[PDB]
Write a protein that binds this ligand. Structure first.
Ligand SMILES: NCCc1c[nH]cn1
Lengths: 336, 232, 218, 264, 53
C-alpha cells in the first residue's frame, strides 16, 4: 500500500509535530490560581407538567424563556422567572431527542427518530403555533438542532453526517460528511460561522458552515460522545463521553486541554454546558445528579443533586443567571 | 384575522339587545375578549372582559351587573347581552381580542365596531388637549397623564396607545409604553415614566392624522384618555 | 400578593395549558405500546397487514376495545441502539423470526439479537412475544438435510414439530432470567387473524400479571 | 405505665400515617389509581390516631370523662366515623384489586382517577353518616362515662355490626379467595408462597383486630349491661392497633412505596 | 484510488494548521475567565435583590 503508508506517516508525524511544540498542561500553569470554593446552588424553580422523560431543552436568548421536549409528545415553552407555561405544542412524533430555540425567538425546531426536523412558528397572526417547515432528507434519527438565523439551521443525525438547511427553501444547503457513526451532538460557535459535532465514533470534528469543510478532527475518548458545547469565547469546546469523563479540547491546539473525571463516576455524561464566564463546566450525568466542575482545575466545585432519574439536558442562560436541568423524571429544575 | 360584530341598531330604553362578535381567522379559544365602546365624538370606554376558558369576567362599574358577557368557543362567537340600556349606553361597541403571556401584544387587533343607539378608586387618565394642528414632515409629541404610577413591581408600564383614523377602528401602536405593535411603521415611539407619558411621532405622514388614545392596563377597570386629535 | 391584570391572565393561561397536558397523559396510558422487531428478510409486510387497518414507523389498530400502538424499527439503519431506551415501558416486544431464516448463518445473528434484548436492562422485565407465523414453507425446506449445515448443536432426526421444539428449546436458554419476563411463542398458520388474537391474549396475560405485582401477590 | 405504652402506640400511628400521605404527595410515580385508596386509608387511620385515640387514653387515666358532654359526643362521633372509614377504605381497596385482576382490560375503560376519587368520597360519606344517631338518637347515663345513646338497643346494634364488619368481611374473604385462585392459575404456568403469605397476613390482621370488638358490640347489645368495662376498652384498643398496622401491610407491599420511604 | 484520497487530503489540511499550542492557548482561557469573573452570576453570587429567581 502507498496511500495508507502516507496516511499513517502523515498522522504520526503531524501528531509528533503537535507533541514537539506541546509545552505544558493547563494545570501546570493554572495551579497558582485559587479555586472557587463550594458552589452551593439551590433549586429556585421546579417546572413540572411533563408526563414522560424529558429529552431536550434549550434556553431563550433573553435568558427568561425555556423550551423542553418530552417522550410524552409535547414541547413546552416556560417562563423561567414565574414558572409559567407560555406555550404547549403537540409534536407529530413522540420520539423527540433534540430541540432548539430561534435566536430571535420567533421559531422553535425539534426532531428525533423519524429523521425529520419540524420547525414551528410562534409569533403567528392567528395566535397558535403552526409548523413552518419539515426539513427532511436525513436517513437516520436526528439530534442537536441549532438555529443559525431565522432561515438557516444545522442538524446532526445518526447517518454519520451533519447538514445545513435553508429553512425557506427546505433544501440541504450543505452536507458535512466524514463520520463513521451516529453524530450525537453539535454546538454552534458564538459567531455562527463554525460548529463542532461529536459522534458515536468516539471522535468529534470542527466543521465550517460556509464551505462544508472538515476543518479539524478531535480524538481522545474511548466511547461515544453524547454531548458537546462551546467555550463562551468560541476557542474551545468540551465534550461529554459515555466513558464517564468530560474533555475540554482547544480548536487551535489540536489537542485536549484537560480531562474532568473522578473515580466515583462510573457512568457517562449526558449533557454539558458552560458558565457565562467560562469557569463552571456543568455536566449532567446518569447518576441522577448533575455536577459542577471548576473548568480550569477539574474539581467538582459543588453538585446539583436532584431528580430521581438520570440528567439528560443542561442549559446556562445567556447572562449566566441560572442553570436549567432536565431528567427522565419529567421535572425541570432551575438552579441559582 | 377578521372580527365582525352584529347587533347594532336603534332600541328604546328599558329593552334588551345582544351583540355578537363572529370571529374568523385565529384560535378563538386561546384569546380573551373585550367590548370596548365609544360614545359619539367623546372617547373610548371599556365595557367588559372575558378571559380564556370563560374563567374570569370583569365589568365596567357603570353597568356592572346590567351587562353580561358569554363566550362560545367551539363556534367562535362572542356575545355581550345588555339587559337594561339608558340614554348613556348609546355608543359604537368594538370587539377586541387580547392574548396574555410573556411577550404578547394584548390589544393587537380591534374589530370593526357596531353602532348601538338608544333614544332619549378607578385610575383616571387625562389627555392634555383635544386638537393639535400640524403639517406633514413635522415631528409631533402627544402626552397624557395618569392618577397612580403605572410602573408595576414587574417593571411593565401597562400603558396602551391607540389610533382611530377618521372612519376606521382603533389600531394598537404601543402596548406597554415602549413596544411597537405589529404592522405599524417604526417611526412611532413612546416614552415617559411615573404618571406622565408621551408619544412621539417622527416624520409624520398624511395618513397618521386621527384621534389618538392612551389606556392603562395596570388594574381593572380599564380607563381611556380623553382623546388627542391631530389636525391637518 | 396582588397580581397585575396581565400577570394574572398569564397565570390563568398556564393553568389551561397544565390541564390539557394532564388530560392528554390519561389517554396515553389507555393504549398498549408494543415494540415490533424482526430479523432481515423474515417477513414483516404480512403480519402488519393482518392487523385491523423514513425512520420509526408507528401503526395503529384498535382490536376488541384495545388501542394498540406498534412501533416498527425497519426504518432505522444505525444499529448502535442509542434509541432503544426510548422504548422503555412498552407492554411487549413482538419479535418476529420465521423458520426460513437460514436461507439468506442465522444462529449467531438471531441468538445475538435475543441475547441483546434479554440483556438490556430496559427490556429484561417486559414480556417478549415470539412469532413464527406461516406454515406454507416451514415444512418444504426442513427435509433438504439435517440442520448440521449451520446449526452444529443438533445432529439428530429433523421432523417439523420436533425440530421446531428444539429451536424453541434452545431459545429459552437465550433468556438469561425467566423470573420476571415470559416468552409467548406462537406456531400457527398465517392464513387468518391468528396473529392478532395471540398478541391480544399475550397482552391480557402481561397486563393481568402486572396488576398482581402492584398488589404484591405475583 | 399503661398510658405510656398507649401513648407510644397513638403517636406511632399518627407518625406512620403522615409519612404515607407525604409519600403520595411527593413521588408523582405514586399518583396512580391504586394509591388513592391507600391515601384514604392513611387519612382514616390518621384521624383515629390524632383525634380519637388520645382522648381515649385520657379517659383511661382519669377513670372518668373530664371534658364534659360536648367533647364526649365529639370524641364518640370521631371514633365511629374514623373506624368506619378505615374499614370501608380497606373494603374499597379490595374491590379495586379484585376488579383489576378479573377484568384488566375492561377496567382500564373505567379506572379513571375521577372514579377512584368518587368511590373514596362515597365511602367517606357513608362513614360520616354514623353521626346521625350519635347526636340525634334521643330525638328519634352516668356523667363520668362517655357512651352512646343506643349502646343497649339490640336491633340497631346488630344491624350496625352487620353493615360495618361482617358483610365487608365476608365479601373481602370472597374476593381475596378469587384473587388467590387467579394468582395460583397464573403461577401454574414458590410463586404462590408470597401471594398466600400476603393475603393471609391481610385477612388475619383484619379479622383478629376487628372481630372481638363486634362480638362485644352484639353481646352487650343482648346482655343489657351485664358485662365489664375493661373488656370493652381492650377490644377498642385492638381496633385501634388495626389502624396502627394498616400502613405496615398495604403500602409496604409496593416497591415504589418502599423506595420512597427509603429515600426519606 | 479516489476513496481514501479525500480522507488523506483532509489529513493534509490537518497538517497545515495554525498551531497555537497548549501553553500558547492555556493563558487565553485563564485571561477570559478572569476578565469576565465579575459578570458571572453563578461564580460570584449576586445580591438577593438583583436575583430574578
Ligand atoms: N372504634 C370505633 C368502633 C366502631 C365503629 N363503628 C362502630 N364501632
Amino acid at each position: 500500500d502507498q496511500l495508507r503508508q502516507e496516511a499513517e506517516q502523515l498522522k504520526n508525524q503531524i501528531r509528533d509535530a503537535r507533541k514537539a511544540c506541546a509545552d505544558a498542561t493547563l494545570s501546570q500553569i493554572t495551579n497558582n490560581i485559587d479555586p472557587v470554593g463550594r458552589i452551593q446552588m439551590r433549586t429556585r424553580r421546579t417546572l413540572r407538567g411533563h408526563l414522560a422523560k424529558i429529552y431536550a431543552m434549550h434556553w431563550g436568548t433573553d435568558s427568561r424563556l425555556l423550551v423542553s421536549a418530552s417522550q410524552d409528545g409535547k414541547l413546552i415553552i416556560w417562563d423561567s422567572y414565574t414558572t409559567n407555561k407560555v406555550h404547549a405544542i403537540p409534536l407529530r412524533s413522540s420520539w423527540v431527542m433534540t430541540c432548539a430555540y430561534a435566536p430571535s425567538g420567533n421559531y422553535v425546531a425539534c426532531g428525533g427518530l423519524d429523521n425529520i426536523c419540524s420547525i414551528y412558528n410562534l409569533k403567528t397572526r392567528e395566535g397558535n403555533v403552526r409548523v413552518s417547515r419539515e426539513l427532511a432528507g436525513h436517513t437516520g434519527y436526528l439530534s442537536c438542532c441549532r438555529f443559525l438565523d431565522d432561515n438557516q439551521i444545522v442538524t446532526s443525525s445518526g447517518d454519520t453526517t451533519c447538514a445545513l438547511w435553508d429553512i425557506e427553501t427546505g433544501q440541504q444547503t450543505t452536507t458535512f460528511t466524514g463520520h463513521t457513526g451516529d453524530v450525537m451532538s453539535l454546538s454552534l460557535a458564538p459567531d455562527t460561522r463554525l460548529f463542532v459535532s461529536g459522534a458515536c465514533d468516539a471522535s468529534a470534528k470542527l466543521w465550517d458552515v460556509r464551505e462544508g469543510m472538515c476543518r479539524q478532527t478531535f480524538t481522545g475518548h474511548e466511547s461515544d460522545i453524547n454531548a458537546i458545547c462551546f467555550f463562551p469565547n468560541g476557542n474551545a469546546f468540551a465534550t461529554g463521553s459515555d466513558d464517564a469523563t468530560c474533555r475540554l479540547f482547544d480548536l487551535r491546539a489540536d489537542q485536549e486541554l484537560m480531562t474532568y473525571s473522578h473515580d466515583n463516576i462510573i457512568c457517562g455524561i449526558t449533557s454539558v454546558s458552560f458558565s457565562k464566564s467560562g469557569r463552571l463546566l456543568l455536566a449532567g450525568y446518569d447518576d441522577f445528579n448533575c455536577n459542577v466542575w471548576d473548568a480550569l482545575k477539574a474539581d467538582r466545585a459543588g453538585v446539583l443533586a436532584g431528580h430521581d432519574n438520570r440528567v439528560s439536558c443542561l442549559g446556562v442562560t445567556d447572562d449566566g443567571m441560572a442553570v436549567a436541568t432536565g431528567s427522565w423524571d419529567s421535572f425541570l429544575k432551575i438552579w441559582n | 384575522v377578521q372580527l365582525v360584530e352584529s347587533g347594532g341598531g336603534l332600541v328604546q330604553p328599558g329593552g334588551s339587545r345582544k351583540l355578537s362578535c363572529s370571529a374568523s381567522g385565529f384560535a378563538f379559544s386561546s384569546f380573551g375578549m373585550h367590548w370596548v365602546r365609544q360614545a359619539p365624538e367623546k372617547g373610548l370606554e371599556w365595557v367588559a372582559y372575558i378571559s380564556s376558558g370563560s374563567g374570569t369576567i370583569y365589568y365596567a362599574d357603570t353597568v356592572k351587573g346590567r351587562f353580561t358577557i358569554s363566550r362560545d368557543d367551539p363556534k367562535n362567537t362572542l356575545f355581550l347581552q345588555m339587559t337594561s340600556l339608558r340614554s348613556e349606553d348609546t355608543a359604537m361597541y368594538y370587539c377586541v381580542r387580547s392574548i396574555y403571556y410573556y411577550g404578547s401584544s394584548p390589544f393587537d387587533f380591534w374589530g370593526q365596531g357596531t353602532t348601538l343607539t338608544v333614544s332619549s378608586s378607578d385610575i383616571v387618565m387625562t389627555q392634555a388637549t383635544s386638537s393639535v394642528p400640524v403639517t406633514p414632515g413635522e415631528s409631533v409629541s402627544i402626552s397624557c397623564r395618569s392618577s397612580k404610577s403605572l410602573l408595576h413591581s414587574n417593571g411593565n408600564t401597562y400603558l396602551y396607545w391607540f389610533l382611530q383614523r377618521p372612519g376606521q377602528s382603533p389600531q394598537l401602536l404601543i402596548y406597554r409604553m415602549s413596544n411597537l405593535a405589529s404592522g405599524v411603521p417604526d417611526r412611532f415611539s413612546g416614552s415617559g415614566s411615573g404618571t406622565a407619558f408621551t408619544l412621539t411621532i417622527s416624520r409624520l405622514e398624511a395618513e397618521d392624522v386621527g384621534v389618538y388614545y392612551c389606556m392603562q392596563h395596570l388594574e381593572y377597570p380599564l380607563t381611556f384618555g380623553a382623546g388627542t386629535k391631530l389636525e391637518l | 400578593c396582588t397580581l397585575s391584570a396581565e400577570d394574572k391572565a398569564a397565570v390563568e393561561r398556564s393553568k389551561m395549558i397544565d390541564r390539557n397536558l394532564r388530560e392528554d397523559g390519561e389517554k396515553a396510558a389507555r393504549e398498549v405500546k408494543l415494540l415490533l422487531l424482526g430479523a432481515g428478510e423474515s417477513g414483516k409486510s404480512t403480519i402488519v397487514k393482518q392487523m385491523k387497518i423514513t425512520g420509526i414507523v408507528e401503526t395503529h389498530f384498535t382490536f376488541k376495545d384495545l388501542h394498540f400502538k406498534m412501533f416498527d424499527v425497519g426504518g432505522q439503519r444505525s444499529e448502535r441502539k442509542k434509541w432503544i431506551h426510548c422504548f422503555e415501558g412498552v407492554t411487549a416486544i413482538i419479535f418476529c423470526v420465521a423458520l426460513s431464516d437460514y436461507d439468506l448463518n442465522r444462529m449467531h445473528e438471531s441468538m445475538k439479537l435475543f441475547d441483546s434484548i434479554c440483556n438490556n436492562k430496559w427490556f429484561t422485565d417486559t414480556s417478549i412475544i415470539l412469532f413464527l407465523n406461516k406454515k406454507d414453507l416451514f415444512e418444504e425446506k426442513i427435509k433438504k438435510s439435517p440442520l448440521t449445515i449451520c446449526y452444529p448443536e443438533y445432529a439428530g432426526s429433523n421432523t417439523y414439530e420436533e425440530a421446531a421444539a428444539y429451536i424453541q428449546c434452545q431459545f429459552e436458554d437465550l433468556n438469561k432470567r425467566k423470573d420476571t419476563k415470559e416468552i409467548y411463542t406462537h406456531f400457527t398458520c398465517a392464513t387468518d387473524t391468528k396473529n392478532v388474537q395471540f398478541v391480544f391474549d399475550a397482552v391480557t396475560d402481561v397486563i393481568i400479571k402486572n396488576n398482581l405485582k402492584d398488589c404484591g401477590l405475583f | 405505665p399503661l398510658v405510656v405504652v398507649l401513648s407510644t402506640i397513638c403517636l406511632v400511628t399518627v407518625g406512620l400515617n403522615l409519612l404515607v400521605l407525604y409519600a403520595v404527595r411527593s413521588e408523582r410515580k405514586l399518583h396512580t389509581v391504586g394509591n388513592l385508596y391507600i391515601v384514604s386509608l392513611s387519612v382514616a387511620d390518621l384521624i383515629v390516631g390524632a383525634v380519637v385515640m388520645p382522648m381515649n387514653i385520657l379517659y383511661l387515666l382519669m377513670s372518668k370523662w373530664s371534658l364534659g358532654r360536648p367533647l364526649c359526643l365529639f370524641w364518640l362521633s370521631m371514633d365511629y366515623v374514623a373506624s368506619t372509614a378505615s374499614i370501608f377504605s380497606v373494603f374499597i381497596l379490595c374491590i379495586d384489586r379484585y376488579r383489576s385482576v378479573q377484568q384488566p382490560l375492561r377496567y382500564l375503560k373505567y379506572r379513571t382517577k375521577t372514579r377512584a376519587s368518587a368511590t373514596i368520597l362515597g365511602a367517606w360519606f357513608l362513614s360520616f353518616l354514623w353521626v346521625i344517631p350519635i347526636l340525634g338518637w334521643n330525638h328519634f347515663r352516668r356523667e363520668d362515662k362517655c357512651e352512646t345513646d343506643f349502646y343497649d338497643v339490640t336491633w340497631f346494634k346488630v344491624m350496625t355490626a352487620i353493615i360495618n364488619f361482617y358483610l365487608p368481611t365476608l365479601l373481602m374473604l370472597w374476593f381475596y379467595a378469587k384473587i388467590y385462585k387467579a394468582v395460583r392459575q397464573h403461577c401454574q404456568h414458590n410463586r404462590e408462597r408470597k401471594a398466600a403469605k400476603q393475603l393471609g397476613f391481610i385477612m388475619a390482621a383484619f379479622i383478629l383486630c376487628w372481630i372481638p370488638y363486634f362480638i362485644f358490640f352484639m353481646v352487650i347489645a343482648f346482655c343489657k349491661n351485664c358485662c365489664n368495662e375493661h373488656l370493652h376498652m381492650f377490644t377498642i384498643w385492638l381496633g385501634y392497633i388495626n389502624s396502627t398496622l394498616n400502613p405496615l401491610i398495604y403500602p409496604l407491599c409496593n416497591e415504589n412505596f418502599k423506595k420512597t420511604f427509603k429515600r426519606i | 484510488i479516489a476513496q481514501a484520497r479525500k480522507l488523506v487530503e483532509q489529513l493534509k489540511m490537518e497538517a497545515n494548521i495554525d498551531r497555537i499550542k497548549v501553553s500558547k492557548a492555556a493563558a487565553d482561557l485563564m485571561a477570559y475567565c478572569e476578565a469576565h469573573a465579575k459578570e458571572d452570576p453563578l461564580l460570584t453570587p449576586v445580591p438577593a435583590s438583583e436575583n430574578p429567581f
